[PDB]
Design a protein around this ligand. Structure first.
Ligand SMILES: Cc1nc(C)c(-c2csc(Nc3ccc(C(=O)N4[C@@H]5CC[C@H]4CN(c4ncc(C(F)(F)F)cn4)C5)cn3)n2)s1
Lengths: 545, 111, 135
């Protein structure tokens, strides 16, 4: 009450009289909700400095694990995750004085390298608590800096950011995967000017001549040639799609993707497309003849392409896979088309060897689906990538649920109309009539010349006018709002294509096409130069000299 | 000229791609050589609805051929008309001011 | 560093006894990228008024040409085109005091009418460096 209760010193005096002071001021609440929250946690979270100093004066504990279910991330069923340490708790509640005192104090200090039950350091906790709001990101970035610099002054060794949690994530990839623009962007373009603590920076100042500033971004974790976890692959694959676009549009990442494009990406795609068009032409020529040795060679080529697609789709199971990728247009939508085309080709070959006469229907379906697949390769240009995205959105929409229940509506109204094998015949007649190729000869056989007249008028109205209007209105709703996320998912598709091309290369080929350049950005302990793979980005600014 | 440059080429490219692919697929079910031109003409006539389906019954499998024709008609017509309408609407709602800015340029050029 | 470097006065004091003061403050870098850039260009682009005054007091030059490939328009494969004169450099780096001192000084003044290799005067360079921004 009013920030001070006088009972605490008296109770501590009684405890020290009783000779149980070590076990008195330590409160591992056995309650499953508060499993581990001692008195220090309560003192710190109440925004109190003098009491936390007083309790830590006698040296109770400074690394108490607040393992309670209440102190868990909201996704696991808690309400506030701050790590599991008093130091992390003080750092996650915007308490610069408490975190300062808990480190440079005589009695007992909390090392910033300490990890909780999840392996999360204090920087991981700061990343976890941060969201994309100004009043939060401000102190998160400020005190992330503070802590990194403080852990750099003491213990002149590897920085605190290099400590990975139990998932192998540093704060950088943790922020990239969890989707925080603030702390991630702050880490990416981190520039520290102090001579002693300069190795912590990730953006340098290679050269300057008046109003031109060639900055030199670091690619320690952004671009790794396979033999490490990389921020870019996590951003493109394992991130929050609600917030993925804004984090692929930061200073190094977009230009790094463009550099990969120019280096091998754009030219791999053109080799990749021309090959697919040639294969499709060969497959069409083989199908047109169903000279026989030449068409058998073409069939072997087609089977090779089909088995290649089948292996590519199956191999993803033992790799990054099993999201809710049924509706995503980030090559997830075209992945199922790939698999269906390959399965059609394989089934056609099997029936070609099993004697089933339905081989050719499946093979021609495979050919037509393969041309709709050749529609894939318009992602190389935004003007065509947006067109492909829209046409695939409509294909993923138009033929599905509402058209499916429209077919079921024909089924139901045919069942209702019949007789107030004739069912199928009348169904076909009505299907032809709705399009316009049918006939009105059924009125003669009607048992009730009344009722059906108006009923057929209503049927025509609903089937044609209503469905056409709502179908058109569907893209009417889409286009106005999707004019921008069309290019957003185009950017996602382009980045995914570049990264997928990059993976297929061997490690030596990735290192040969590795972006950036080795630069001696500064000195370290024992005079060892910092040989960091950095990425130059020239800029210009007539405001600061 | 803007529609002819940015939009007409893409529409024609997609239309020809679909037409050539589906026509080759249908010819893959031929029964005996020179039927390319006549079959393409009848498909084009059937696209609007003025064609004849006499050659459809000559195929071995009627069900798959009819289904594939239905898919061709619906996909080409709906998709291409929708993309034309959407692209023209977006262009006229977006770059009207840019066209206003442009017209001044060749007006001054003519002067 | 820190806006001042005490070495330069002693270096010039030695140089005048060496009997090459006119030649000492002159450095047409033989490198292609930095061709012609003398010490006055460096002193001006460092925004050091006192060192510019000191160097021009010894009477070196106020019309040196920065012909290097670095000092070329971005279309030609350069990084910063300010013209090719110390006065043009001072004008293009937003240093009004340097321009004023170079225009009106007792030792030697650079006429505003002088043209570089491209024929650009100071105003042509000012037009070249300007982009359609505010600051
Ligand atoms: C969505 C997707 N899933 C998967 C599995 C996808 C996938 C995997 S591989 C692939 N498609 C490939 C595979 C391999 C190659 C290939 O031989 N190359 C690459 C790199 C070296 C060599 C020659 N090349 C090139 N080198 C320099 C220039 C310079 F002159 F400009 F410098 C120009 N060209 C490009 C091309 N394309 N696509 S895509």
């Amino acid at each position: 009450s009013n920030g001070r209760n006088d009972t605490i010193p008296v109770l501590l005096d009684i405890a020290e009289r009783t000779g149980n002071m070590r076990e008195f001021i330590n409160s591992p609440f056995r309650d499953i909700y508060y499993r581990g929250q001692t008195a220090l946690h309560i003192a710190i979270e109440r925004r109190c400095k003098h009491y936390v100093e007083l309790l830590v004066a006698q040296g109770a504990d400074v690394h108490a694990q607040a393992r309670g279910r209440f102190f868990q991330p909201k996704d696991e069923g808690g309400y506030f995750y701050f790590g599991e340490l008093p130091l992390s708790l003080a750092a996650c509640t915007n308490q610069p004085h408490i975190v300062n005192y808990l480190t440079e104090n005589p009695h007992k200090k909390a090392d910033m390298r300490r990890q909780d039950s999840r392996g999360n350091t204090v920087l991981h906790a700061l990343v976890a608590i941060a969201d994309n709001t100004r009043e939060n990101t401000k102190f998160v970035t400020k005190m992330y800096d503070l802590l990194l610099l403080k852990c750099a002054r003491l213990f002149p060794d590897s920085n605190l950011e290099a400590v990975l949690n139990n998932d192998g994530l540093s704060p950088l990839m943790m922020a990239a995967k969890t989707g925080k623009i603030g702390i991630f962007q702050h880490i990416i373009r981190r520039e520290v000017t102090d001579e002693d603590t300069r190795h912590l920076s990730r953006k340098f100042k290679d050269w300057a001549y008046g109003p031109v500033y060639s900055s030199l971004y670091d690619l320690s974790s952004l671009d790794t040639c396979g033999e490490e976890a990389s921020v870019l692959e996590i951003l493109v694959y394992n991130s929050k799609i609600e917030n993925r676009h804004e984090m692929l549009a930061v200073e190094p990442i977009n230009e790094l993707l463009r550099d990969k494009w120019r280096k091998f990406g754009a030219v791999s795609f053109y080799i990749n497309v021309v090959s697919y068009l040639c294969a499709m032409v060969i497959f069409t020529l083989t199908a047109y003849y169903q000279v026989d040795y030449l068409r058998l060679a073409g069939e072997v080529i087609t089977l090779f392409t089909g088995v290649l697609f089948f292996f590519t789709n199956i191999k993803d199971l033992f790799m990054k896979k099993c999201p809710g990728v049924n509706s995503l247009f980030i090559d997830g939508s075209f992945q199922l088309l790939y698999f269906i085309y390959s399965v059609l080709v394989i089934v056609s070959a099997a029936l070609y060897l099993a004697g089933i006469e339905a081989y050719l229907a499946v093979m021609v379906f495979a050919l037509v689906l393969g041309w709709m697949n050749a529609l894939y390769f318009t992602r190389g240009l935004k003007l065509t990538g947006t067109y492909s995205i829209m046409i695939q959105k409509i294909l993923f929409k138009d033929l599905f649920r509402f058209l499916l229940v429209y077919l079921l509506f024909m089924i139901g109204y045919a069942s209702a109309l019949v007789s107030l094998e004739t069912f199928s015949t009348f169904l076909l007649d009505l299907f032809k009539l709705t399009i316009g190729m049918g006939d009105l000869e059924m009125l003669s056989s009607t048992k009730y010349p009344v009722v059906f007249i108006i009923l057929l008028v209503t049927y025509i109205i609903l089937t044609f006018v209503l469905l056409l209007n709502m179908l058109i209105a569907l893209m009417g709703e889409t286009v106005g709002q999707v004019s921008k996320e069309s290019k957003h998912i185009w950017k996602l598709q382009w980045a995914t294509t570049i990264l997928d091309i990059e993976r297929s290369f061997p490690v030596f080929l990735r290192k040969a096409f590795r972006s950036g350049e080795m630069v001696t950005v500064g000195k370290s302990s024992d005079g060892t130069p910092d040989r960091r793979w950095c990425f130059r980005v020239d800029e210009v600014n007539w405001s600061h000299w | 000229q803007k529609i002819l440059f940015k939009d007409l080429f893409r529409f024609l490219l997609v239309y020809l791609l679909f037409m050539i692919g589906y026509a080759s697929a249908l010819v893959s079910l031929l029964n005996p050589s020179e039927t390319f031109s006549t079959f393409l003409l009848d498909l084009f006539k059937l696209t609007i609805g003025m064609g004849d389906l006499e050659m459809l019954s000559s195929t071995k499998y009627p069900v798959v051929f009819i289904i594939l024709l239905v898919t061709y008609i619906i996909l080409t017509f709906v998709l291409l008309l929708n993309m034309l309408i959407a692209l023209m609407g977006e262009t006229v709602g977006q770059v009207s001011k840019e066209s206003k800015h442009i017209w001044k340029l060749q007006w001054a050029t003519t002067i």
